[PDB]
Amino acid sequence: GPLPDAKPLVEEATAQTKALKSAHMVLTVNGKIPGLSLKTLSGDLTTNPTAATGNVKLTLGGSDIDADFVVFDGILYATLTPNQWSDFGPAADIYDPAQVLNPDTGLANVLANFADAKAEGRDTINGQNTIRISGKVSAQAVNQIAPPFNATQPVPATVWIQETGDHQLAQAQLDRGSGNSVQMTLSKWGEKVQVT
Protein backbone atom coordinates (compact mmCIF):
# COMPACT_ATOMS: atom_id res chain seq x y z
CA GLY A 1 0.00 0.00 0.00
CA PRO A 2 1.70 3.18 1.30
CA LEU A 3 5.46 3.59 0.78
CA PRO A 4 8.00 4.47 3.50
CA ASP A 5 9.90 7.78 3.25
CA ALA A 6 12.90 7.19 0.98
CA LYS A 7 15.42 9.43 2.78
CA PRO A 8 15.58 7.57 6.12
CA LEU A 9 15.60 4.29 4.22
CA VAL A 10 18.58 5.36 2.11
CA GLU A 11 20.37 6.63 5.20
CA GLU A 12 19.83 3.28 6.89
CA ALA A 13 21.02 1.34 3.81
CA THR A 14 24.08 3.59 3.76
CA ALA A 15 25.03 2.64 7.35
CA GLN A 16 24.39 -1.07 6.72
CA THR A 17 26.39 -0.98 3.50
CA LYS A 18 29.40 0.59 5.28
CA ALA A 19 29.52 -2.43 7.62
CA LEU A 20 29.46 -4.97 4.80
CA LYS A 21 32.42 -7.37 4.59
CA SER A 22 31.25 -9.70 1.81
CA ALA A 23 28.46 -10.37 -0.69
CA HIS A 24 27.49 -12.13 -3.89
CA MET A 25 27.06 -9.68 -6.78
CA VAL A 26 25.60 -9.83 -10.24
CA LEU A 27 26.46 -6.99 -12.61
CA THR A 28 25.19 -6.34 -16.11
CA VAL A 29 25.58 -3.60 -18.68
CA ASN A 30 22.61 -2.79 -20.94
CA GLY A 31 23.41 -1.21 -24.32
CA LYS A 32 26.86 0.32 -24.66
CA ILE A 33 29.05 2.34 -22.32
CA PRO A 34 32.00 3.60 -24.42
CA GLY A 35 35.23 2.17 -23.02
CA LEU A 36 33.59 -0.57 -20.96
CA SER A 37 33.88 -4.01 -22.55
CA LEU A 38 32.15 -5.97 -19.79
CA LYS A 39 28.69 -7.35 -20.52
CA THR A 40 27.83 -9.50 -17.50
CA LEU A 41 29.54 -10.72 -14.33
CA SER A 42 28.52 -12.89 -11.40
CA GLY A 43 30.72 -13.57 -8.40
CA ASP A 44 31.48 -13.51 -4.71
CA LEU A 45 33.42 -10.77 -3.01
CA THR A 46 35.00 -10.52 0.39
CA THR A 47 37.13 -7.76 1.88
CA ASN A 48 39.64 -7.26 4.68
CA PRO A 49 41.29 -9.06 3.12
CA THR A 50 40.15 -8.78 -0.50
CA ALA A 51 39.35 -11.89 -2.50
CA ALA A 52 36.92 -12.54 -5.38
CA THR A 53 35.77 -15.43 -7.58
CA GLY A 54 33.16 -15.64 -10.30
CA ASN A 55 32.51 -15.56 -14.02
CA VAL A 56 32.55 -12.72 -16.47
CA LYS A 57 31.37 -12.28 -20.04
CA LEU A 58 33.26 -9.51 -21.83
CA THR A 59 34.36 -8.40 -25.28
CA LEU A 60 38.08 -8.72 -25.94
CA GLY A 61 38.78 -7.88 -29.57
CA GLY A 62 35.25 -7.98 -30.95
CA SER A 63 34.59 -11.48 -29.62
CA ASP A 64 32.39 -12.40 -26.67
CA ILE A 65 34.44 -14.27 -24.03
CA ASP A 66 33.19 -16.23 -21.03
CA ALA A 67 35.93 -16.45 -18.41
CA ASP A 68 36.11 -17.57 -14.81
CA PHE A 69 38.07 -15.14 -12.65
CA VAL A 70 39.78 -15.01 -9.26
CA VAL A 71 41.32 -12.11 -7.36
CA PHE A 72 43.65 -13.31 -4.65
CA ASP A 73 46.55 -11.60 -2.92
CA GLY A 74 46.12 -8.50 -5.06
CA ILE A 75 46.38 -10.45 -8.32
CA LEU A 76 43.81 -11.09 -11.05
CA TYR A 77 43.58 -14.50 -12.75
CA ALA A 78 41.13 -15.58 -15.45
CA THR A 79 40.46 -18.50 -17.74
CA LEU A 80 40.56 -16.96 -21.19
CA THR A 81 40.51 -20.51 -22.51
CA PRO A 82 38.68 -23.30 -20.66
CA ASN A 83 40.37 -24.60 -17.51
CA GLN A 84 43.47 -22.56 -18.34
CA TRP A 85 44.39 -19.92 -15.75
CA SER A 86 46.22 -16.79 -16.87
CA ASP A 87 47.80 -14.24 -14.54
CA PHE A 88 46.92 -10.66 -15.48
CA GLY A 89 48.94 -8.95 -12.80
CA PRO A 90 47.74 -6.64 -9.98
CA ALA A 91 43.93 -6.49 -10.02
CA ALA A 92 44.11 -2.81 -9.09
CA ASP A 93 45.63 -1.99 -12.49
CA ILE A 94 42.37 -3.15 -14.06
CA TYR A 95 39.75 -2.77 -11.30
CA ASP A 96 40.19 -3.50 -7.58
CA PRO A 97 37.05 -5.50 -6.73
CA ALA A 98 37.12 -4.28 -3.10
CA GLN A 99 36.24 -0.88 -4.54
CA VAL A 100 32.61 -1.93 -4.66
CA LEU A 101 32.49 -2.43 -0.89
CA ASN A 102 34.83 0.39 0.06
CA PRO A 103 32.84 2.38 2.64
CA ASP A 104 34.20 5.67 1.26
CA THR A 105 34.18 5.16 -2.52
CA GLY A 106 31.99 2.10 -3.10
CA LEU A 107 28.28 1.38 -2.89
CA ALA A 108 28.06 3.17 0.45
CA ASN A 109 29.37 6.36 -1.25
CA VAL A 110 26.87 6.04 -4.09
CA LEU A 111 24.12 5.86 -1.47
CA ALA A 112 25.53 8.82 0.49
CA ASN A 113 25.52 10.85 -2.75
CA PHE A 114 22.11 9.72 -3.91
CA ALA A 115 19.99 12.90 -4.18
CA ASP A 116 16.25 13.56 -4.60
CA ALA A 117 15.42 10.15 -3.12
CA LYS A 118 11.76 9.28 -3.86
CA ALA A 119 10.04 5.96 -3.15
CA GLU A 120 8.46 4.79 -6.40
CA GLY A 121 7.11 1.32 -5.61
CA ARG A 122 7.78 -2.19 -4.30
CA ASP A 123 9.59 -5.02 -6.08
CA THR A 124 10.74 -8.53 -5.21
CA ILE A 125 14.53 -8.97 -5.55
CA ASN A 126 15.78 -12.53 -4.91
CA GLY A 127 12.64 -13.42 -2.98
CA GLN A 128 12.71 -10.34 -0.75
CA ASN A 129 10.41 -7.32 -0.58
CA THR A 130 12.19 -4.09 -1.49
CA ILE A 131 11.34 -0.45 -2.00
CA ARG A 132 12.17 0.85 -5.48
CA ILE A 133 13.57 4.34 -5.10
CA SER A 134 14.49 6.95 -7.75
CA GLY A 135 17.11 9.70 -7.49
CA LYS A 136 20.33 11.08 -8.86
CA VAL A 137 23.85 10.07 -8.04
CA SER A 138 26.66 12.66 -8.18
CA ALA A 139 29.04 12.42 -11.08
CA GLN A 140 32.00 12.08 -8.76
CA ALA A 141 30.51 9.19 -6.77
CA VAL A 142 29.65 7.43 -10.03
CA ASN A 143 33.12 7.87 -11.50
CA GLN A 144 34.78 6.59 -8.36
CA ILE A 145 32.91 3.27 -8.37
CA ALA A 146 32.73 2.99 -12.13
CA PRO A 147 35.44 5.10 -13.90
CA PRO A 148 34.52 4.12 -17.50
CA PHE A 149 31.09 5.65 -16.86
CA ASN A 150 32.65 9.11 -17.29
CA ALA A 151 29.76 11.00 -15.65
CA THR A 152 29.70 14.73 -16.31
CA GLN A 153 26.52 15.57 -14.39
CA PRO A 154 24.26 13.89 -11.78
CA VAL A 155 23.27 10.41 -12.92
CA PRO A 156 19.67 9.26 -12.84
CA ALA A 157 19.55 6.14 -10.70
CA THR A 158 17.27 3.58 -9.08
CA VAL A 159 18.07 1.62 -5.93
CA TRP A 160 16.05 -1.14 -4.32
CA ILE A 161 16.45 -1.40 -0.56
CA GLN A 162 15.09 -4.14 1.75
CA GLU A 163 11.78 -2.89 3.14
CA THR A 164 12.26 -4.81 6.41
CA GLY A 165 15.02 -6.58 8.33
CA ASP A 166 18.56 -5.29 7.82
CA HIS A 167 17.56 -2.77 5.12
CA GLN A 168 20.43 -3.83 2.82
CA LEU A 169 20.96 -2.45 -0.70
CA ALA A 170 19.52 -5.21 -2.92
CA GLN A 171 19.96 -3.59 -6.32
CA ALA A 172 21.19 -0.39 -7.98
CA GLN A 173 21.02 0.95 -11.51
CA LEU A 174 22.77 3.91 -13.12
CA ASP A 175 21.23 5.25 -16.29
CA ARG A 176 23.61 6.72 -18.87
CA GLY A 177 20.87 7.92 -21.22
CA SER A 178 19.12 6.09 -24.03
CA GLY A 179 18.94 2.44 -23.04
CA ASN A 180 22.56 2.44 -21.87
CA SER A 181 22.95 1.45 -18.22
CA VAL A 182 24.81 -0.54 -15.62
CA GLN A 183 23.03 -2.46 -12.90
CA MET A 184 24.20 -4.56 -9.96
CA THR A 185 22.33 -6.90 -7.60
CA LEU A 186 23.73 -7.77 -4.18
CA SER A 187 22.81 -10.89 -2.19
CA LYS A 188 24.16 -13.18 0.51
CA TRP A 189 25.60 -10.33 2.61
CA GLY A 190 28.28 -11.78 4.89
CA GLU A 191 28.81 -15.08 3.10
CA LYS A 192 32.17 -16.74 3.65
CA VAL A 193 34.08 -16.40 0.44
CA GLN A 194 35.86 -19.49 -0.82
CA VAL A 195 39.55 -19.80 -1.27
CA THR A 196 40.14 -19.17 -4.93
Resolution in A: 2.0
Tell me the domains of the chain and their CATH numbers: 1-196 (2.50.20.20)
- Rounded to whole angstroms, how far apart are CA atoms 112 and 13? 9
Measured at the CA of 48, the angle between CA 13 and CA 131, to 5 degrees, comes to 15
Cβ contacts of residue 14 below 8 Å, gap of 6+? 108, 111, 112
C-alpha dihedral (88, 91, 92, 93), degrees to nearest 10:
10
Going by the DSSP 8-state scheme, the letter that residue 143 receives in this structure is H
- Rounded to whole angstroms, how far apart are CA atoms 45 and 107? 13
57 DSSP β-pair partners = 40, 66
Experimental determination technique: X-ray
- Rounded to whole angstroms, how far apart are CA atoms 162 and 57? 28
- Rounded to whole angstroms, how far apart are CA atoms 178 and 31? 8
